[PDB]
């Protein structure tokens, strides 16, 4: 049946090439021999045998077989290398996680400078991302690695979230110790810069706000190399963490340690004054310092900016293809 | 989409183990020993109850596709617990599972691990994953015992006695093939039902529908008493054959 | 890691802007000409221009303006670089010693902002109270010109109008006032605001918004006699001052877009206008004085003067002399006469300044069997199209062969003693239903001619509608002789067929040498071409014979000969064809993992593919198997302009951001993943747009030439006419030259006080990295031009390595020899 994963062989796919390098193996583009569908194969190598099958892949299998949303990437099956016949110990062949093939990734489209986003294209982008983030948050899962490279958009204007290698369940009642450094420094939330370690789903919302701002400038907002410099850049824009706006900042491990140059005032609305009013309000609420005052995924979907977007009107981004040469 | 992980009691007469000449009593004994091995090892390691149960459900499922005569059970058990730890985010190093296994197992039993215990377990991970068809998410009677108990309102002390007694039954049902016959939701109800009969409690009074004598039907739709009694019979038989008596 | 050296063989020749004023002395009339990164200062004479000074700047010159604040004797110069480096400069001369003073400087980049579509705009107040900068959408940046602002500190005023086309500071206003044409969904409008340095905000401007032409392009601030502004469009020129609105719509300007403007008479009575077909107009402002003692504008008139080179910048000098600065063709001095000549023209060319124009493609060929090599470049566009033959002999000798149409690709075929050149000409839909060319060109002045009669797409059934006046490109293959450069033959391709790629080679066991062209069927409706041809021609006995044609399902962007087989890139696919004994192309193997295979290069059985957005990939042909294998890819994303192979392990690429990089095989076989990661080991901001990389050198090689430290030679051609050379170094030579750069940068004074390290930093809107793996040859070759005190200051405590001596001190005289040897490669 369709559900008997791990047995079908990777012979069934014609490998087109290597689309990218992942965490637990390389990612390849491939065509299914039977259907002609294009797939993306993530290679999982347990040959290292340091600690066996990688947990990053275990998370992505465990969670993505549970999550069924248009804006969440779909794992179709898990296939294997030709296994050694009647010799299970010597078998070092790897496993492949089959996904749908998405035409492009956001970082590539922006780094190459080949995308222009109108307000209406940003509306369709964010409604899908937040709707899928909402779906995940309603299911009590945190992504913990929202970057532009984990947002896949195909030319049809459909957005899908993808690298769940760091996803774990969140319980509001049961506070649990979690890994401090989770989201990429450019998109890292302020609380994790101070090391909350018991963070809320709001961490993902901060990353998406960073994307929201980035889509309006085409340049990431908080570009730093070190955790302190990042807190400085965030502070120059959002204001310095202080009990006046974040009463519990005093509870954070590095609060007294990582002071910014000044106690800056918030200028987010001034430095982003070129943004439409409905959007600017969304950015201000998503880039709120205190995670308990930062808006939820649902609240962004009930905003003037996203509330009245019809997903029938996908409005694909302006991707130049001809005349890019001349 | 998703695989079916529940069989009928009559089907257990045809596990690989049975067809290689193992009798029903022996396979049942092997299942109890392998599960209790998983439980005790993880308890020493400080593992969450869900992690222990997940390993057991993997273990029980595994020997629905393979024979106990070709796959030594304590190696299988150790592997299941090792994977369960990663699945449930309570990870342990394989060397630490082997260490605890050595303490709890006698020399003959630890012989199953062969000359290199850690390797034999790590190798089996490939087979385990293919056997469970990479369906790693598992639900356990515990969550439903607490979700349903939260909706009961009444004497704080009578309900807590019901829950703890039912909890002990859930732990004991893991040593049985019930995990492979009935969904966890039914198990949680069955253990509430059992604890109720023994404690002379009438659970319907604690529900929002106090004159609905089949109290469970608001929690688990379509469950006949036939099923709940079958489950209760199986759990109590484990207490009668063993020395232990009802928890009270 | 990898070590390489980049040197400029010919400086940028395109004129990007030109201004006039009194910069060198309050007395002299100056002409400042800006080429990319280069500033040329001239003094206006009665015969032409007297050069006085040239400086380089560590930045692309984006804004260039002269102004004279109260208290100064002479004009000061403002320059803003494309990296947002601002400075104010002064000319100072002490007898024979000429130097440029940096009076104020700073970087005006904002942490947050959207770069505007119409680019950086910089304007200065008529009272020189402030500098206006339009850098980002929705923001107006003000640098107030107070004496104390030596760092050029500035503030932003919120601008409601996000999409601004153009802005100027208006004349005759009680306060500083800006006039701008902006775009919103309701069309284009002209609006005015006032600028308050005290309040640091806009106040309501003198006159109301008026709706303007949809394609309103340029704003002219008219001087005091008639205060106001003129708005230039595609069809109409309009004047707006308060309630006065006048508009002229002469049919002559509708034909070609007007791109430049300049004031002839300071009163504002006459302005010059230029358009894309090179036509030069006079815009005459007709005066009406009122009995009130006031001067008003009676009418606007446009008069055609003649033809100039397609001009990026115009500036009127004196008498009848006008400087024509062209980026597409040669710049000029032309004289405007009061009386027309017998052809009706008032314009007569005086001097012609060489511009290698846009270098679309180029090849190196030893025409005279000299062992040297000459560079035949495809240069210029449209009517200024040309082929340029460049040879060394101390200055480069450049011959220009006018084509009068846009050249696209060039390749040399020795067997035929001729070149093949792809070209396109612009024709316009005419009343016959067909098209008519605006002027004769090479594709029409060929001795013999042909037109492909291919029936491949003949079935069509795709409706394409034509409106009178629309432009079309007509593509041709030109056979041009290597000695005379007579256009021997011109082959015209199918209607709507673009010629994209060209090779000359033999295939298989076929002894004939062919011209092969790859094409694309281009229809306005298509996002990406879905039809195309590979055509095999034979040039024999003065006639081009169509030998074979292969239909493809895309655009043949790039082709290259590959060990007797034809390697071609069709959109996503990279394909290898074999040439059969039946003289037809047969597909052997394909590679499909690409977005758009724009560029191809080969070496042995290795193929380097340049992609639209995925940078560079190293492929290989496995002959034992008859297919392709991906060896390694550059996973860092980049938009490619051209690529080249340096050696079996190092690969060179160019970015659309004016950046260069080198990728190398990781050469570490620990994991398969390491082997497949091409690692960028070289990063360098060139400052130019590289279109073509070509192996070769123009230096005479007698085998007796002292062996240079550098190994290898790659020449490259850019949009601004700049020609450069990339060559490799040993680890020892790099470290020496790199350590010397750091010493030179501390010693050499930069114009605008721009840090050299900043200038060469890799720069995209999203990234900025320090340069690596590249030696700036121009900094190294400037050591020979610094004064002796500075030379000895540079060599202090300098030590050599990895050579005859493990630690050897350097003297100033030792380096003079090394750098001189390095000057022999360019
Ligand atoms: C595995 C699954 C989640 N998946 C499904 N479709 C995609 C997907 N699709 C976007 C994508 C598509 C094409 C290319 C590409 C094309 C030609 C040459 C080189 N790369 C890159 C990214 N890109 C990624 N990531 C790209 C960056 O690395 C890591 C993988 N994963 C995906």
Residue numbers in the entry:
A (entry chain B): 715 to 1040
B (entry chain C): 20 to 267
C (entry chain A): 1 to 393, 708 to 1140
Give the published text.
Recently, several unexpectedly diverse compounds were reported to deplete cyclin K by linking CDK12–cyclin K to the DDB1–CUL4–RBX1 E3 ligase. Crystallographic dissection of 28 ternary complexes demonstrated that despite considerable diversity of the molecular glues, the overall complex architecture is highly similar. The low-affinity DDB1–CDK12 interaction primes the complex, while the ligand, through filling the kinase pocket and bridging over to DDB1, drives robust association, offering a rationale for the unusually broad chemical diversity observed.
The inversion at this stereocenter (S-CR8; DS28 (43); EC50 = 32 ± 1 nM) or introducing a morpholino at the R2 position (DS19 (44); EC50 = 14 ± 0.3 nM) gave rise to compounds with comparable activity to CR8 (R-CR8 is referred to as CR8 throughout), suggesting that hydrogen-bonding interactions between R2 and the CDK12 backbone do not strongly contribute to binding. We also synthesized six compounds that are hybrids of SR-4835 and CR8 (DS18 (65), DS17 (66), DS19, DS22 (67), DS21 (68) and DS20 (69)), yielding a series bearing all possible combination of the R1-3 substituents. SR-4835, DS17 and DS18 were CDK12 selective, while CR8 and DS19 were not, linking potent pleiotropic CDK inhibition to the co-existence of phenylpyridine and isopropyl substituents on the purine scaffold. Hence, the modification of the gluing moiety from phenylpyridine to dichlorobenzimidazole (CR8 versus DS17, DS19 versus DS18) is sufficient to increase the gluing potency and reduce off-target CDK inhibitory effects of CR8. Notably, the compound’s Tanimoto similarity to CR8 and its in vitro activity show no clear correlation, with the ten best DDB1–CDK12 molecular glues (DS18, 21195, DS72, DS17, DS19, DS25, DS73, SR-4835, CR8 and DS16) ranging from CR8-like (1.0) to distinct (0.33), further supporting that diverse chemistries facilitate the formation of this complex.
